[PDB]
Design an enzyme around this catalytic site. Sequence first.
Site, PDB file in Angstrom:
ATOM      1  N   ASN B  88       0.813  -1.187   0.000  1.00 21.51           N
ATOM      2  CA  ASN B  88       0.000   0.000   0.000  1.00 21.51           C
ATOM      3  C   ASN B  88       0.857   1.251   0.000  1.00 21.51           C
ATOM      4  O   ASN B  88       1.783   1.378   0.854  1.00 21.51           O
ATOM      5  CB  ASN B  88      -0.928  -0.022   1.198  1.00 21.51           C
ATOM      6  CG  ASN B  88      -1.914  -1.191   1.147  1.00 21.51           C
ATOM      7  OD1 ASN B  88      -2.188  -1.731   0.061  1.00 21.51           O
ATOM      8  ND2 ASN B  88      -2.465  -1.507   2.242  1.00 21.51           N
ATOM      9  N   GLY B  94      -4.409   3.057   0.881  1.00 22.04           N
ATOM     10  CA  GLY B  94      -4.825   2.609   2.224  1.00 22.04           C
ATOM     11  C   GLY B  94      -3.638   2.271   3.098  1.00 22.04           C
ATOM     12  O   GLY B  94      -3.596   1.202   3.732  1.00 22.04           O
ATOM     13  N   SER B  96      -1.277   2.212   6.139  1.00 19.19           N
ATOM     14  CA  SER B  96      -1.697   2.412   7.528  1.00 19.19           C
ATOM     15  C   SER B  96      -0.567   2.837   8.422  1.00 19.19           C
ATOM     16  O   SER B  96      -0.824   3.392   9.482  1.00 19.19           O
ATOM     17  CB  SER B  96      -2.350   1.133   8.090  1.00 19.19           C
ATOM     18  OG  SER B  96      -1.470   0.014   7.925  1.00 19.19           O
ATOM     19  N   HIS B 101       5.952  -1.955   4.052  1.00 13.20           N
ATOM     20  CA  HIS B 101       5.608  -3.293   4.547  1.00 13.20           C
ATOM     21  C   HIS B 101       4.839  -4.015   3.422  1.00 13.20           C
ATOM     22  O   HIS B 101       3.973  -3.468   2.805  1.00 13.20           O
ATOM     23  CB  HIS B 101       4.819  -3.230   5.832  1.00 13.20           C
ATOM     24  CG  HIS B 101       3.563  -2.393   5.766  1.00 13.20           C
ATOM     25  ND1 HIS B 101       3.579  -1.023   5.798  1.00 13.20           N
ATOM     26  CD2 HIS B 101       2.250  -2.744   5.781  1.00 13.20           C
ATOM     27  CE1 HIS B 101       2.342  -0.559   5.815  1.00 13.20           C
ATOM     28  NE2 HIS B 101       1.518  -1.583   5.784  1.00 13.20           N
TER      29      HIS B 101
END
Lengths: 115, 115
Positions: B88, B94, B96, B101
């Site tokens: 992402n 999105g 976070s 990661h």
Amino acid sequence: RPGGDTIFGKIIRKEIPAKIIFEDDRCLAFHDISPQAPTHFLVIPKKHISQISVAEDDDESLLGHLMIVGKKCAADLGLNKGYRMVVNEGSDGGQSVYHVHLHVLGGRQMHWPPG
Amino acid sequence: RPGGDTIFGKIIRKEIPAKIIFEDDRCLAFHDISPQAPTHFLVIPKKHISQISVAEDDDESLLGHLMIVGKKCAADLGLNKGYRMVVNEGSDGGQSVYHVHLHVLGGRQMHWPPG
């Protein structure tokens, strides 16, 4: 066969039309024929790796190169708000072609879970 | 702060518990606390890259390493029917946590589009 004996191999060898975004000696970026977002492209190695689960340790740089190229292409295509990168492996991954390919999607809100 | 100042930096430094699958000098694999599939883990670099769009050219090997580690881990965890890898980026992606990661999801049929 070289570029492999998938449709992506045909695309690599210029036997079939695709909308090419970027090319180098290692890899090829092109717009996906079945886009799932306002922007949706693939970045694929020129070397025929059938699926990520058979990639070798010395493919490491190649694999990172697809992500680096993917991120540069995303920026060049004006995806300032972001994007999602996806690699699918096998049946459960919904892998559609047996040639490794990194999806890059944006131009809309990507949702969770990612399929 | 080696590992950065995000919750992932805390996990890297063993300041907070996570369920660790694999560790080396370059990266850490651990299970996602909010799993979106029967098997759902993250592979993160130990170096703090905030997001893929600020990754450098010479991070290429590192980025591939997360995919190579991700695929090894998926095999060790018995995802022999396949899996999906996701990164992402930014708001539309999105994303976070502002530390790069690679999600790895399997143990079920992943659907299309990938969010």
